Amino acid sequence: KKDGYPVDSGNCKYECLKDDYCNDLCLERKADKGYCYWGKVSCYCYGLPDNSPTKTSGKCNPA
Q: Using the chain's own numbering, where are the disulfide bonds?
């Protein structure tokens, strides 16, 4: 398990508007708990899957 920014298949960091949205969406990804790191960033979870796809080197692009 590990914490980090859960990015979709194309590296789409699940952005957020409130800490609660990140916590919930965080629990769905399989994280125990997670808040919302604004600072032009995204949601932050804690407990995501080991190999969970997280920010690597992309900008979220439909393809």
A: 12-60, 16-36, 22-43, 26-45
Residue type, position 32, single letter: D
Residue 14, token pair as written in the block: 């699940």
Cβ–Cβ under 8 Å, residues 19 and 25: no
CA gap 32, 21 in Å, rounded: 14
CATH code for the domain in which residue 17 is found = 3.30.30.10
**Residues 19, 29: Cα–Cα separation, whole Å:** 15
In angstroms, the first-to-last Cα distance of the chain is: 28
Which structural domain range is residue 54 located in? 1-63
Task: State the structure-solving technique.
Answer: NMR
List, in order, residues 6 or more apart from 47 with CB less than 8 Å away.
1, 3, 26, 30, 31, 32, 33, 34
